[PDB]
Amino acid sequence: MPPSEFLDKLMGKVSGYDARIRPNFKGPPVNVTCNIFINSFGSIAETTMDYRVNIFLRQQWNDPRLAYSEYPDDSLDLDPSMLDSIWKPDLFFANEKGANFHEVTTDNKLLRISKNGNVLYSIRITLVLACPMDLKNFPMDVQTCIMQLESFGYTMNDLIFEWDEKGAVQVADGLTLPQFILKEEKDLRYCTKHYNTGKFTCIEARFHLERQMGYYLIQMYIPSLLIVILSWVSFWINMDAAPARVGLGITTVLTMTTQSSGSRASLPKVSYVKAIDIWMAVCLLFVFSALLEYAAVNFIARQHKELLRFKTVEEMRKLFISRAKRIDTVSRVAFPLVFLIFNIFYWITYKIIRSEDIHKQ
Amino acid sequence: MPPSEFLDKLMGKVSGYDARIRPNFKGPPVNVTCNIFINSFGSIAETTMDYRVNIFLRQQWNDPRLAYSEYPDDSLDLDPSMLDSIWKPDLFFANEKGANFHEVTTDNKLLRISKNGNVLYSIRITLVLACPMDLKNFPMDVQTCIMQLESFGYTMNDLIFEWDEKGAVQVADGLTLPQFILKEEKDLRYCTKHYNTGKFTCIEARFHLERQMGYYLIQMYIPSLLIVILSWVSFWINMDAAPARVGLGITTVLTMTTQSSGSRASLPKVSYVKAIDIWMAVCLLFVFSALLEYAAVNFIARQHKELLRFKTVEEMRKLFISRAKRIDTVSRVAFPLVFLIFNIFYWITYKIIRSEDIHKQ
Amino acid sequence: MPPSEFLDKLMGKVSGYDARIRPNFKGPPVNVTCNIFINSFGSIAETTMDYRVNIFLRQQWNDPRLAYSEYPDDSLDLDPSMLDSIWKPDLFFANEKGANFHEVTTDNKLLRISKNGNVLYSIRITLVLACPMDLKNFPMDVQTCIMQLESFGYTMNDLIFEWDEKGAVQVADGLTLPQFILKEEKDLRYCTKHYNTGKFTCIEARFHLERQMGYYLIQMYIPSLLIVILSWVSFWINMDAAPARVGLGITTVLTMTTQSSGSRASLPKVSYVKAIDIWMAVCLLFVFSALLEYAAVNFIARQHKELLRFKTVEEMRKLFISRAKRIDTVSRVAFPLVFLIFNIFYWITYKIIRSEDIHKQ
Amino acid sequence: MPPSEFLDKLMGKVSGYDARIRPNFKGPPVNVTCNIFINSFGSIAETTMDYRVNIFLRQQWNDPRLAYSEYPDDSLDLDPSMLDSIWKPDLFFANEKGANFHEVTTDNKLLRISKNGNVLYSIRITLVLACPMDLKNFPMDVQTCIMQLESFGYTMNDLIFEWDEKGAVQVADGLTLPQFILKEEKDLRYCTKHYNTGKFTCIEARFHLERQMGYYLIQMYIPSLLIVILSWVSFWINMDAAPARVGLGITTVLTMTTQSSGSRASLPKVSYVKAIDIWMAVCLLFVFSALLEYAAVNFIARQHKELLRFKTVEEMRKLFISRAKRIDTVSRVAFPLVFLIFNIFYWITYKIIRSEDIHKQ
Amino acid sequence: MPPSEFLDKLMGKVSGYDARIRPNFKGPPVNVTCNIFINSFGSIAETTMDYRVNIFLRQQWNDPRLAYSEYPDDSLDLDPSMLDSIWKPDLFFANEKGANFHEVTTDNKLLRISKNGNVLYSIRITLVLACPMDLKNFPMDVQTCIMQLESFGYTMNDLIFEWDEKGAVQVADGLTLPQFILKEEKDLRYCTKHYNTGKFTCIEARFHLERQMGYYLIQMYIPSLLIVILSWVSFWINMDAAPARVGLGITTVLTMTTQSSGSRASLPKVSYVKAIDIWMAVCLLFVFSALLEYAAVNFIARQHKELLRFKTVEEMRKLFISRAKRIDTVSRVAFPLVFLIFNIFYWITYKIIRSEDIHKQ
Numbered sequence A, B, C, D, E: 001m002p003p004s005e006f007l008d009k010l011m012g013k014v015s016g017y018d019a020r021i022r023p024n025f026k027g028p029p030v031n032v033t034c035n036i037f038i039n040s041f042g043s044i045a046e047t048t049m050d051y052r053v054n055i056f057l058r059q060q061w062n063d064p065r066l067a068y069s070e071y072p073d074d075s076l077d078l079d080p081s082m083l084d085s086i087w088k089p090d091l092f093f094a095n096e097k098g099a100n101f102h103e104v105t106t107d108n109k110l111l112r113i114s115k116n117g118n119v120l121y122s123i124r125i126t127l128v129l130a131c132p133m134d135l136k137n138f139p140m141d142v143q144t145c146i147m148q149l150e151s152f153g154y155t156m157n158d159l160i161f162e163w164d165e166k167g168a169v170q171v172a173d174g175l176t177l178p179q180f181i182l183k184e185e186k187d188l189r190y191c192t193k194h195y196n197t198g199k200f201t202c203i204e205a206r207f208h209l210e211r212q213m214g215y216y217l218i219q220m221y222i223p224s225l226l227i228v229i230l231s232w233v234s235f236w237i238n239m240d241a242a243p244a245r246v247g248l249g250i251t252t253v254l255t256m257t258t259q260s261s262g263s264r265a266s267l268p269k270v271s272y273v274k275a276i277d278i279w280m281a282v283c284l285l286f287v288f289s290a291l292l293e294y295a296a297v298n299f300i301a302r303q304h305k306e307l308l309r310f311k312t313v314e315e316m317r318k319l320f321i322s323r324a325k326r327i328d329t330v331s332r333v334a335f336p337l338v339f340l341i342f343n344i345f346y347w348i349t350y351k352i353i354r355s356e357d358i359h360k361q
């Protein structure tokens, strides 16, 4: 039997197929079992709130008309061009942008018709999937990225989408994310879309994403610590040298302000407080408190010099000078100890909150 | 009756349909009732002055020729490919950019023909809708975003567009906007476009948008307050220490200037004064006034030292030194009280103006 | 008479039309009268030197073959799809980028054939029109934006383009430009393109654009004034306090430099001096002159202290100290008066130059 | 003779043309003479290393089959749609990106068939041409931008490309470049591409571009001069005032550093030294040398005060104080004279190197 | 024999070819030998992690049906339009974005059919190839960029891809990369993709890229050295002048911080430490240590003045003053020597690590 005649015969104008009609019309719904292979993952953007993926979508459904018995070979892979009339099931992604096809050299498609009528349809597509991301704890957090595959134009009674029994989501070996870690466990759950038109089958997969803390520690946490240490250095400088201590406190407060403003620039304009805001707030409060401490010392010395040059004035001079010296001596010890207590408290609470988020999943 | 023959018969070359002609030609106008479902809303940009939406446009019109009585089933959902010849009514969005269709896997369309000839047409489209936004009160404001659906090429006598009686605009459950709040109430009003060619039916929907004030309070209002408090701290420093007080006043004025310039960078170049401009102007006036106050104190002490080293000169020395000390003492109390009075006045007026805008709608 | 047969008959294969041929071939030129309606105007970019417009281009020409007498109704609006063969006259925009068509829901076109053979053709198109803009006076200027409609492939003897007698350019009511004001008067003038191939008809419309000065006054002119006032404040500070006065002069000069550099960033790299350059140059000269004035005062006091500690030396001490005090006293009065004279001179000259540009048009 | 029949006859299915075959097959090569008209030139980007042009490509070749004698009129301009089968010669640009066609209103093409069989083909295209640009002398330089027109799929024996005898490159009158000057003289030279497949004809045109020095003088050269003059001002300030002189030297060095870093931001990351680097290096060396000079003066005065307060100590005090005073006195004269000598040397050498580049062409 | 009839005959409807079927069906696999010519290479982006190339892909395979003996000429180059039915083998790039074709003037393709049935197919395509790049040593590193050519829809038994025996990868002469150096040696290795669908042939080429160190030395290494030298200059200034030394140390630490933050902005957010981080960390530690050294000197002098003004107090005054003077004297020598030792250690280790990376390849 010539191959050309057989392939033509399946699509044969003489034969009745009428691609527009679904298989087993006025009957039980067509069941489509689909599994995606994730070729590339990346380009996650917090500001735009979307991530880009490249996937091989594979759809398996049974068509009775396409059954053939003339050829013993059951595999019978076919040319992708003659995919015009194999009743491609309509599918679309509920949350998407873009979703272009790949036309390079030849269309990236794979049509394979089994002997019993099972059809394997494989298409390569890049998806700009948009997923909302909670930025409550910006430094360390776990983001769930969800892709929904939903039918358009065929109701649930008409068409049903089911996740593949084995290997529904497959990740390419060696695929890595620079800013994130992809969890191996995957959530395969189906939610049925309800509209005024009717109920349409939909299935969705959830990808847990864990943000690596290596960059943020170096970029943000270590510099702020340096600025706070510089403000601590200001205590050892002489109280008499007012421009040096004042300028040092001012410069550290200004540096903390510009660093805090600059860090959060590459982020969406969310209205809720973040972990990074708490850290920046406390560190900026520390440097501001150091400047206030010098202002208090200078004012006490001013009162000393006021009583000095216009009665127990000598006693008052010793008291006020001892008072200022005492504030400096207590301050140099007290400031790092309090900062250490805050640092361990903040890290412990955020680590257990991260553990709680991992507990919830 | 075979399904293929029936579907072919409706579109049947043997039968007369002639898609180019509208239903009930040389007769009463075709009435189209349309309701949109908003799948995704976001990407609002003040600078570009546009917002992006993804919608399921649904159009219902009655075609007498498409009436069928052979099949008892009235629903009879059909394949979207055979939408070439169902007389799709021309519609376009009056204010748009882009407006691409979704071609992923299969075209996102839904053709449903009822027994009486009613046609349900549902298409998914992303619209870069451009709406002018009044930025009189930039911090807190209510923006109305308007989408117009207007016929092109068919006059009002020829074709009429009407909003659906029930559920004209439907918002997807759980849809949220990071920077804005979407009001539940919606304005459905039709305005008829008039041109030299003729009058064309148009209908429009207004979406009230309320801008959340959570981010702007943290990002802009709280830092400016910190700079003003730093300028107040400058009073407690000794009058003799001229570089410290001068440098502190200069640094705060410079910081206020760069913060004010940086904040308004992500905004269109509108010529009218905004609320944020008033707040930045007053706070910068406060820090500038603090620097002028120190300049006055230093000049009074200079006149004291002028009379000191070259008659009532001793009396003049006590007067001038008391005068400078008095200006400092009055200033430390006076500056925060005046700032508090301005702050409550500004918040009260802007809150009642916001209430007035909500009153107008 | 059935409508379908009549519409088919006009385009009838049986009848001779041959769309490729122009009307009244080997005869007088086809005369096309065209008027544009400006739906949206905006997105003007100085750096890119282009502006984006959305227009309804309407072309009216007379075709004798399309005359019909069978139907009394003269209007007879038709479906836009059957525009393949109505001899669309070739038109293109001489200075353009992009120029995409709008394909949303259905093609945005309007074909209307009159009884005598007059054809009304209306298409909606967005044009990235590029117009050179003179930036001699950047702050306040009038820019003329020109759109040219020129034939391609048909010579002047073959085809002629004429502006509509009434309402050649129509602007949508309520259309506004945030950064510019659009003048009501319009220049309709035709210039004939000459090439080695031949002479091709072209027509052009000029849109005068006036740049609003509200933003630039607040953003650029008011801060520079603040920096100059700060430099004036430096005079009242004591001459003995060298770090305070020196640092203040340095900071103001640096601030003026960074403000001048930052302002002109969003501008093309033109080689000619602008009004904003003159203003920045003079204000920066003022702050630089203030720093030089303090350097002179400090040097005179230095010479006093040189003569003081190693003859009329006492006389020289009084002279030099009086000299420095005199320079400060004269300087505090002299600097704002001179700046006021410059300010009124600059505003008067630029206002009359703006008036002269309005005089020229 | 009816026009429709004649035009149809040339493309006539009855007649043999077979568009796929080239003219005079198995014979001498087809000779194509092509001239381009440059409608718009601009959008040159140093970083991306490309420039965008809009051109009217005109190709003239002789086809014997298209000869006609039935009509006396030799011009016989034709509709651009029937360009499917006039054997368009394959041409492509060797160094390109984009290269989109213009589809606005109607395709921008011009087919003109002469009586002898000469075919004139004119297409409008925008080309993102990428040309490497030597940035040895960044401030003033001459860049050559080259466009190559090369055949694809037809060997040199099969097809030959030749530049038009008269007017090969035509520039639109009044076309101007904001940042560059276009030289009138043009290089028309053909280079034959050699591949393993075979030899393919190619022709190329070189556009000399001269960069205007007006902007760079104002933006970069004048500010650096201001910073150097400010460092010179530092000498007149008293040696005793250590914070003023130190802060002034620091601020000028920092300002020079940020200006040098900021200027070269809009440039590719080339590894070779540029003229602007030499200028920034020398000016920054001048301000750094001024700060070192003050450090030397302060150290000499320190040694004076060391010998002062713990033998010829008095003699040493006069020597050291005279030494510091001498360094200041010599420095104020010496620094501008040396800078003037460098400035004239740099301008003379770069001007003669520019002249040498113009000499080479 | 007429050429048209012969070309038509090969594609002849009368003859059996059936393009959908592969050559020698139900037989040994089709063997495709492919070599790419790299026309342009560049646009490497670290942040996006992709590079753009323009290539001439050439595929050679043998088709028995296309054998011809009627014409003696074996070359017989053909028109690219009749490439619809020459059984183009499906190929796609495993890691790609974009991959557009070039449609300018005519499609850029070359079909050449040999006498024995060998088919040469050459297409020009621009590929946005994405390759992960290890940034362990950011300053100097060697990056391997890999392009994979893999079959889609034909299994390994069905179709095999092989690299050309001679000249598999050809680079255009004179092609250069501004920021990188391309190694002449190339890795041609084939890896077979394994999927659940089956095994598909793939071949890949590796391009070693060496990053030039010329720019980074000037832009980053030389400024940091300048800041460290400025901090060394701070030692020569008098210990009594507390504002000058304090301000100088603060300014250098701040400058180092902003330079370090600014440099790494154009880089991906990787979590691992880089060479540039080590260099910035050490240099910033040096400037911070200089500021701590002045704080220690000032504190020792403070203790001297504490013992001075409220027993061996005189002895303590000489000891403490000598101690501070000793710290300054030792510090001025010690700091550059230690920095020199670090500099040679860092350069030696990174150079041998670069040599080790070149050793591994």
Ligand SMILES: CC[C@H](C)[C@H]1O[C@]2(CC[C@@H]1C)C[C@@H]1C[C@@H](C/C=C(/C)[C@@H](O[C@H]3C[C@H](OC)[C@@H](O[C@H]4C[C@H](OC)[C@@H](O)[C@H](C)O4)[C@H](C)O3)[C@@H](C)/C=C\C=C3/CO[C@@H]4[C@H](O)C(C)=C[C@@H](C(=O)O1)[C@]34O)O2
Pocket: A214, A217, A218, A219, A222, A223, A225, A226, A229, E256, E257, E258, E260, E261, E271, E272, E273, E277, E278, E280, E281, E282, E284, E285, E288
């Ligand atoms: C320690 C902080 C105080 C403020 C110190 O600051 C100073 C001086 C001494 C102070 C005590 C300044 C500080 C650096 C240190 C010098 C320390 C370096 C040798 C490095 O650091 C160590 C510590 C670091 O552990 C957080 C540790 O990371 C590991 C974590 C993980 O393995 C467990 C793993 O992921 C990976 C292997 O790496 C690692 C051993 O490297 C240096 C690499 C840190 C980067 C330095 C700079 C990079 O750009 C940063 C910032 O953009 C710039 C603005 C300021 C720099 C700075 O902030 O400078 C900066 O941060 O000295």
Ligand SMILES: CC[C@H](C)[C@H]1O[C@]2(CC[C@@H]1C)C[C@@H]1C[C@@H](C/C=C(/C)[C@@H](O[C@H]3C[C@H](OC)[C@@H](O[C@H]4C[C@H](OC)[C@@H](O)[C@H](C)O4)[C@H](C)O3)[C@@H](C)/C=C\C=C3/CO[C@@H]4[C@H](O)C(C)=C[C@@H](C(=O)O1)[C@]34O)O2
Pocket: B257, B258, B260, B261, B271, B272, B273, B277, B278, B280, B281, B282, B284, B285, B288, C214, C217, C218, C219, C222, C223, C225, C226, C229
């Ligand atoms: C007056 C200048 C000196 C330097 C004064 O500076 C300071 C203190 C006092 C000095 C004398 C600083 C200056 C502001 C003033 C405070 C003045 C405010 C109340 C406002 O101003 C007035 C004057 C203004 O008339 C030019 C006038 O505009 C009209 C013009 C038109 O109607 C005729 C019309 O279009 C429209 C209605 O508005 C208007 C009544 O509002 C305030 C709104 C000005 C904006 C303030 C700031 C906005 O961001 C600017 C800049 O990005 C930032 C960097 C510095 C600010 C500043 O520069 O601060 C800034 O400019 O105090």
Ligand SMILES: CC[C@H](C)[C@H]1O[C@]2(CC[C@@H]1C)C[C@@H]1C[C@@H](C/C=C(/C)[C@@H](O[C@H]3C[C@H](OC)[C@@H](O[C@H]4C[C@H](OC)[C@@H](O)[C@H](C)O4)[C@H](C)O3)[C@@H](C)/C=C\C=C3/CO[C@@H]4[C@H](O)C(C)=C[C@@H](C(=O)O1)[C@]34O)O2
Pocket: C257, C258, C260, C261, C271, C272, C273, C277, C278, C280, C281, C282, C284, C285, C288, D214, D217, D218, D219, D222, D223, D225, D226, D229
């Ligand atoms: C002269 C330099 C020293 C440093 C002077 O600096 C200061 C004070 C006095 C010092 C001696 C500062 C300096 C400006 C001058 C004031 C001079 C202005 C009146 C103008 O200048 C003159 C000189 C200029 O000739 C180079 C000359 O150009 C011609 C060249 C060509 O015709 C032969 C032709 O192409 C075209 C016609 O224009 C022209 C007559 O205009 C002013 C227009 C210069 C621009 C001023 C500023 C623009 O933004 C610049 C920079 O972004 C900012 C950061 C600092 C400013 C500055 O740097 O300020 C800045 O440059 O005063």
